[PDB]
Design a protein around this motif. Structure first.
Motif, mmCIF file in Angstrom:
data_model
loop_
_atom_site.group_PDB
_atom_site.id
_atom_site.type_symbol
_atom_site.label_atom_id
_atom_site.label_comp_id
_atom_site.label_asym_id
_atom_site.label_seq_id
_atom_site.Cartn_x
_atom_site.Cartn_y
_atom_site.Cartn_z
ATOM 1 N N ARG A 7 2.428 -44.845 -78.601
ATOM 2 C CA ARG A 7 2.345 -45.878 -79.620
ATOM 3 C C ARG A 7 1.918 -45.279 -80.955
ATOM 4 O O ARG A 7 1.510 -44.119 -81.041
ATOM 5 C CB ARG A 7 1.368 -46.975 -79.200
ATOM 6 N N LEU A 8 2.024 -46.089 -82.009
ATOM 7 C CA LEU A 8 1.726 -45.604 -83.354
ATOM 8 C C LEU A 8 0.229 -45.397 -83.558
ATOM 9 O O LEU A 8 -0.210 -44.316 -83.967
ATOM 10 C CB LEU A 8 2.280 -46.579 -84.391
ATOM 11 N N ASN A 9 -0.575 -46.424 -83.284
ATOM 12 C CA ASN A 9 -2.019 -46.289 -83.431
ATOM 13 C C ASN A 9 -2.632 -45.501 -82.283
ATOM 14 O O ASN A 9 -3.643 -44.816 -82.486
ATOM 15 C CB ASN A 9 -2.654 -47.676 -83.511
ATOM 16 C CG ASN A 9 -4.064 -47.653 -84.065
ATOM 17 O OD1 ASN A 9 -4.586 -46.614 -84.454
ATOM 18 N ND2 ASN A 9 -4.691 -48.818 -84.098
ATOM 19 N N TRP A 10 -2.026 -45.557 -81.094
ATOM 20 C CA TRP A 10 -2.566 -44.828 -79.952
ATOM 21 C C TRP A 10 -2.431 -43.321 -80.125
ATOM 22 O O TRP A 10 -3.260 -42.569 -79.602
ATOM 23 C CB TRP A 10 -1.875 -45.274 -78.669
ATOM 24 N N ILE A 11 -1.427 -42.870 -80.884
ATOM 25 C CA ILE A 11 -1.244 -41.440 -81.117
ATOM 26 C C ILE A 11 -2.367 -40.893 -81.988
ATOM 27 O O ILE A 11 -2.952 -39.849 -81.688
ATOM 28 C CB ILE A 11 0.135 -41.168 -81.743
ATOM 29 N N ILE A 12 -2.690 -41.593 -83.075
ATOM 30 C CA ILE A 12 -3.790 -41.155 -83.925
ATOM 31 C C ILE A 12 -5.144 -41.427 -83.296
ATOM 32 O O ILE A 12 -6.135 -40.800 -83.686
ATOM 33 C CB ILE A 12 -3.731 -41.826 -85.305
ATOM 34 N N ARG A 13 -5.225 -42.353 -82.340
ATOM 35 C CA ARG A 13 -6.470 -42.516 -81.604
ATOM 36 C C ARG A 13 -6.696 -41.339 -80.664
ATOM 37 O O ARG A 13 -7.770 -40.723 -80.668
ATOM 38 C CB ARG A 13 -6.458 -43.838 -80.835
ATOM 39 N N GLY A 14 -5.684 -40.991 -79.868
ATOM 40 C CA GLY A 14 -5.847 -39.926 -78.896
ATOM 41 C C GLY A 14 -5.848 -38.540 -79.502
ATOM 42 O O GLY A 14 -6.419 -37.612 -78.923
ATOM 43 N N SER A 21 -3.581 -49.223 -67.370
ATOM 44 C CA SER A 21 -2.936 -50.046 -66.353
ATOM 45 C C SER A 21 -1.414 -50.096 -66.449
ATOM 46 O O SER A 21 -0.798 -50.644 -65.526
ATOM 47 C CB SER A 21 -3.500 -51.475 -66.370
ATOM 48 N N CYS A 22 -0.816 -49.692 -67.590
ATOM 49 C CA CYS A 22 0.238 -48.676 -67.737
ATOM 50 C C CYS A 22 0.952 -48.657 -69.075
ATOM 51 O O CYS A 22 0.518 -49.269 -70.051
ATOM 52 C CB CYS A 22 1.284 -48.636 -66.627
ATOM 53 S SG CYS A 22 0.704 -47.440 -65.394
ATOM 54 N N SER A 23 2.039 -47.879 -69.111
ATOM 55 C CA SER A 23 2.868 -47.687 -70.296
ATOM 56 C C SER A 23 3.498 -48.970 -70.826
ATOM 57 O O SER A 23 3.963 -48.984 -71.969
ATOM 58 C CB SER A 23 3.969 -46.674 -69.987
ATOM 59 N N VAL A 24 3.527 -50.044 -70.047
ATOM 60 C CA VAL A 24 4.031 -51.319 -70.525
ATOM 61 C C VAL A 24 2.894 -52.212 -71.024
ATOM 62 O O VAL A 24 3.011 -53.435 -70.989
ATOM 63 C CB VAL A 24 4.866 -52.034 -69.453
ATOM 64 N N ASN A 25 1.781 -51.610 -71.455
ATOM 65 C CA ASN A 25 0.614 -52.352 -71.924
ATOM 66 C C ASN A 25 0.902 -53.160 -73.178
ATOM 67 O O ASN A 25 0.951 -54.393 -73.119
ATOM 68 C CB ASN A 25 -0.550 -51.401 -72.205
ATOM 69 N N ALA A 26 1.140 -52.456 -74.290
ATOM 70 C CA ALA A 26 1.208 -53.021 -75.643
ATOM 71 C C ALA A 26 0.014 -53.931 -75.927
ATOM 72 O O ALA A 26 0.150 -55.041 -76.444
ATOM 73 C CB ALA A 26 2.531 -53.754 -75.874
ATOM 74 N N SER A 27 -1.174 -53.445 -75.570
ATOM 75 C CA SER A 27 -2.401 -54.222 -75.647
ATOM 76 C C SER A 27 -3.488 -53.408 -76.326
ATOM 77 O O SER A 27 -3.638 -52.212 -76.063
ATOM 78 C CB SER A 27 -2.871 -54.654 -74.255
ATOM 79 N N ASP A 28 -4.245 -54.067 -77.192
ATOM 80 C CA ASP A 28 -5.387 -53.468 -77.876
ATOM 81 C C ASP A 28 -6.535 -53.057 -76.944
ATOM 82 O O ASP A 28 -7.180 -52.038 -77.225
ATOM 83 C CB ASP A 28 -5.899 -54.411 -78.969
ATOM 84 N N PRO A 29 -6.862 -53.776 -75.855
ATOM 85 C CA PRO A 29 -7.769 -53.144 -74.879
ATOM 86 C C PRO A 29 -7.098 -52.049 -74.069
ATOM 87 O O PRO A 29 -7.720 -51.014 -73.803
ATOM 88 C CB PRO A 29 -8.214 -54.313 -73.990
ATOM 89 C CG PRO A 29 -8.014 -55.508 -74.806
ATOM 90 C CD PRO A 29 -6.782 -55.230 -75.594
ATOM 91 N N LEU A 30 -5.842 -52.245 -73.676
ATOM 92 C CA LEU A 30 -5.150 -51.299 -72.800
ATOM 93 C C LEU A 30 -4.473 -50.224 -73.646
ATOM 94 O O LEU A 30 -3.253 -50.181 -73.812
ATOM 95 C CB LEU A 30 -4.156 -52.034 -71.912
ATOM 96 N N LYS A 31 -5.306 -49.346 -74.195
ATOM 97 C CA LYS A 31 -4.873 -48.278 -75.093
ATOM 98 C C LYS A 31 -4.234 -47.044 -74.435
ATOM 99 O O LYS A 31 -3.080 -46.745 -74.767
ATOM 100 C CB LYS A 31 -6.048 -47.845 -75.980
ATOM 101 N N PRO A 32 -4.895 -46.298 -73.527
ATOM 102 C CA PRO A 32 -4.538 -44.874 -73.370
ATOM 103 C C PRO A 32 -3.219 -44.580 -72.658
ATOM 104 O O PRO A 32 -2.859 -43.399 -72.588
ATOM 105 C CB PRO A 32 -5.717 -44.303 -72.580
ATOM 106 C CG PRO A 32 -6.185 -45.400 -71.791
ATOM 107 C CD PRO A 32 -5.990 -46.644 -72.595
#
Length: 98
Positions: free
Chosen positions: A1-8, A34-45
């Motif tokens: 994801r866009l924000n998940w890349i700069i988070r990780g 809980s997986c790659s189909v998250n698209a959720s702000d808690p379910l980040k990594p």
């Protein structure tokens, strides 16, 4: 994801480099994403790897070995900065103290 890349990529490693002890090297597939189909702000990594009932296709012992090497060289460069400050402070104090 866009924000998940700069988070990780950038928002994660400096906290590990500071040395406050994480539990992040402990568990895999503990359902924090809980997986790659998250698209959720808690379910980040986003579910690091899929395999037979365990997350890693290649396990966490490399992940803790590289972590220890990273901490070793980071403390090397930190103590290098410590001696870099100490050389100037001692060159100040190598002058006549009276």
């Amino acid at each position: 994801r866009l924000n998940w890349i700069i988070r990780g990529a950038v928002y994660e490693p400096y906290i590990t480099i500071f040395g406050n002890f994480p539990t992040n090297i402990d568990n895999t597939l503990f359902d924090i994403s809980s997986c790659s189909v998250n698209a959720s702000d808690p379910l980040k990594p986003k579910c690091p790897m899929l395999n037979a009932d365990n997350t890693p296709v290649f396990p966490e012992w490399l992940t803790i070995m590289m972590l220890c090497v990273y901490l070793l060289f980071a403390n090397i460069l930190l103590l290098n900065l410590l001696i870099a400050i100490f050389n100037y402070t001692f060159q100040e104090v190598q002058d006549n103290t009276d």
